[PDB]
Amino acid sequence: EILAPVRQRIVTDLETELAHFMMNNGALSLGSPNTPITKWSDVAQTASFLKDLGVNEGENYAVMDPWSAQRLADAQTGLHASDQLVRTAWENAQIPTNFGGIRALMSNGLASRTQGAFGGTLTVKTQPTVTYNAVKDSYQFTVTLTGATASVTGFLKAG
Amino acid sequence: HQFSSLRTPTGDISGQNKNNLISGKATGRVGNYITVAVEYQQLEEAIKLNQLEEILAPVRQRIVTDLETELAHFMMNNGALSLGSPNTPITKWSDVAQTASFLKDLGVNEGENYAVMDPWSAQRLADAQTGLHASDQLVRTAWENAQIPTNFGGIRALMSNGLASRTQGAFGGTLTVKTQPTVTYNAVKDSYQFTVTLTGATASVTGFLKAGDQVKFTNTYWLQQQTKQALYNGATPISFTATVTADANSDSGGDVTVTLSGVPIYDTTNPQYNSVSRQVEAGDAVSVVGTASQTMKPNLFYNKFFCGLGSIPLPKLH
Amino acid sequence: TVLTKGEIVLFALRKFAIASNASLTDVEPQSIEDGVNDLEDMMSEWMINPGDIGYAFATGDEQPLPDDESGLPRKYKHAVGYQLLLRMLSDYSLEPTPQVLSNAQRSYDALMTDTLVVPSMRRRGDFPVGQGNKYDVFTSDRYYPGDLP
Amino acid sequence: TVLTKGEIVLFALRKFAIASNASLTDVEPQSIEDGVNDLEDMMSEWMINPGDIGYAFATGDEQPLPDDESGLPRKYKHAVGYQLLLRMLSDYSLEPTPQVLSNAQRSYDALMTDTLVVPSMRRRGDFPVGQGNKYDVFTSDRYYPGDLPLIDGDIP
Amino acid sequence: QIPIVGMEQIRGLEKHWEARNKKRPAFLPLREVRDKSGNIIAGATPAGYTQ
Amino acid sequence: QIPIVGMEQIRGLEKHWEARNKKRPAFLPLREVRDKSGNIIAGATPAGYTQ
Amino acid sequence: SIDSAVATYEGFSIRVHKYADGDANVQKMRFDLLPAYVCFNPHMGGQFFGNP
Amino acid sequence: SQIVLKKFLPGFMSDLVLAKTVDRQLLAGEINSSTGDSVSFKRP
């Protein structure tokens, strides 16, 4: 009885930590965080950006919430000429593998983060050192900000 | 069972605690007999009662219909989940797909999912289906036979006219909780029901909350059972909801005590069994879904392992 | 008709005629509190050999009073009174009569019969349950479970 | 709630007619000192046959006092007092009545009931354990351990 | 066969006799039979057994 | 079979009886049965055995 | 000197152990896993949301 | 309330898409007893 729900706990914890690491170390950003994903362009913009940067050797992937997939399947149900696509979206509400040129995926277990209170017209105070000799081992650098709120703990959260 | 994990750089767990086997059980019970009995004199059987088998044919279907009706009553009484408001019927495609999306979002994995509606809702769904743009066969079927496919929005949809009906029961006022309930897992692991008292109701109304009424807790949110993250429907997090079990009455001062099915477990000593983002403190605002005295025939959606049915075989007499 | 702790002491005194309603000579109030203390300690020791019979103890830092509710049913009154009388006769330098002894024995036996409990022996737990019980439907069917907890 | 050493001696002198309200007698300090000393010696003796019942002995420097707390539970006082009375009645050259003897015996048996413990005869150690316990995997012992403690590996 | 005893003889000692077949006690405790005056009239053995 | 004894007869000597099958004692100690007046009414043998 | 076994679940190896420390008749088990992480280039990933 | 069945009632479970998509071939059996607690790759 113990064996069945313990491996699942281990795997779930591992993947939650993996997702946290991925969104803590990722750099690129797109769109306004408040607005959800509703239309076809919201997915294709990622593929367009990735192709624009120049990354080719590999494979690209986008992961989204189950509720977001309904909003794309519902949009797909309104198509005009593809019988198979309309039929599949109407019956099983399943989006195709290649959505906008990128591999779309569905995941219900996905980490969530808190923004953290901030305020003031921020600006950089001291010029940082971004020479390649300094950041050739990590691609990380430290910057100092000014013009912030007087004294607030948790000004900037992780992510 | 459910468990919790630990994080240490090297594996030293000497001074920490360990997961115990807190076991909960679900109990089912028997009901009342369903009896149909007739009688007649010997003279009538001798000179008047002919074609007796054809006369007595429909007793079995009467029995089965009564069983099905009371089963539907039980199913609608013991449910906990809720989507939408009774003031609006099903008209669009998303109104059915939302159930499948919600069931997937919670984390239901085993079994098959079902959705049952009344014939008028099926007619409206077929009418919406006839307006498609590409599928000629599907549109022709919906136009001629006024039917819908077996799968619909990722969930199996069925149309039945045997569903029962319920009534809301008058209510009013900004309902708020009065006393903090007990929702520790060790206390509720046996029945999955909890009792709360409200405040701010009407002066004195009989049947303030009737059976099957649903209560929504605004400022507390559902929680995905496995990874323990809150549920978001885009930009609006989903709120915890329950169902009234038995009829309740309101006395002077607007105080009413009700028993609900489905529980907001938030245990601070056993975090493994949490199912809700935060506890329900005193003064939390609630609301009741529906209208003051509306009556309607409820639609139902569930999983395979939600409710169970059994027919005990009875023995002979002497 | 609640039963007070002081009524049992009065009953014990009257039964052997140390003091009664028409005695013309009553005991000092110190003897009453001595009897109450003796009754309390007798119940404290009765918590061991006989079962608990619902006696009310002066929990806390206070002390018993003769007007405090005992909590016992009326059916135990004669038994408790006779036992206390047998306990405290020697205080007054006396000696019980055989009839009093027989009455006390009868009441004590009645109390024992009323409070009797008989345990039932369960099986060891390595006993094989018969093949005619369909022992592959639930656990603890291949062999008996034994005593629980 | 507190059972002092002076309560037991007074209880004995009250259950007998030496000094009580009923007998109209004022108590004498010599009797108190003698009773307290005899009780202390008796409770020292009781370490062997009856057992340890939570008595609080005085330290070597000071002397026992009647008002000092004793530590005995409330459910032992009749047994203790009756035993002390039986051990002390000879001081005044008096003969106990049969009823007092019966009460003392009953209280002593009630005390002995509470502290009873019945040992269990553990297996010898050379007794084999069958294959039904799967001694190759389930339990590392092919024979019963007897007196050996569980292995530490740092203590051999 | 079942042993037969008196109520005053086994009261307070039932748990030892209840588990005499599972545990391995070195002995079994039981009291003697006393009359109304406190004198011992019978031994600590059980009165008898059923047939 | 289990021997039957009284509480006051074996108190303080249980360790000798619990280990009568592992060690090899030359004898076993046990007390006599005494009434409330201190007179001996029965020998030092056990009262009886279970059937 | 501790009973051990390996359980596999979609390509992940889990080590399970059993020991009987404590004289309170308390059997104890533990499951372990040790992962490793690395970020190659931050400029090939990130977050994305919708826009109005 | 005493008789119990043997089939555990089904529970909840999440889904796995993150682990299957990340790169798990370059770093595989590379942190052994000889390398230490970290290994490093090269850059173009």
Coordinates of C-alpha atoms in Angstrom, one line a residue, chain A residues 21-28 50 53-57 60 132 135-140, chain G residues 37-47, chain H residues 23 26 41-44:
Chain A
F21 CA 14.4 26.2 -11.6
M22 CA 13.3 26.7 -15.2
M23 CA 11.3 29.8 -14.5
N24 CA 14.0 31.2 -12.1
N25 CA 16.8 30.9 -14.7
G26 CA 14.9 31.7 -17.9
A27 CA 15.6 35.1 -19.4
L28 CA 13.2 35.8 -22.3
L50 CA 12.7 31.8 -31.1
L53 CA 16.9 35.0 -32.3
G54 CA 18.5 32.3 -34.5
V55 CA 18.2 29.0 -32.5
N56 CA 17.7 26.1 -34.9
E57 CA 19.5 23.0 -33.7
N60 CA 11.1 24.1 -29.3
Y132 CA 32.7 39.0 -21.4
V135 CA 30.4 36.7 -17.2
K136 CA 31.9 33.9 -19.3
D137 CA 31.2 31.3 -16.7
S138 CA 27.7 32.1 -15.5
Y139 CA 25.8 34.6 -17.7
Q140 CA 24.8 36.3 -14.4
Chain G
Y37 CA 20.6 20.4 -12.5
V38 CA 22.3 22.6 -15.1
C39 CA 21.4 25.7 -17.1
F40 CA 23.2 25.9 -20.4
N41 CA 22.1 29.2 -22.0
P42 CA 19.5 31.5 -20.4
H43 CA 18.8 33.2 -23.8
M44 CA 16.9 30.1 -25.0
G45 CA 13.9 30.1 -22.8
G46 CA 11.8 32.0 -20.3
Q47 CA 8.2 32.9 -19.6
Chain H
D23 CA 17.7 17.4 -22.3
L26 CA 24.4 15.1 -22.4
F41 CA 30.8 21.8 -20.5
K42 CA 32.4 24.0 -23.1
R43 CA 31.0 26.9 -25.1
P44 CA 31.0 27.8 -28.8

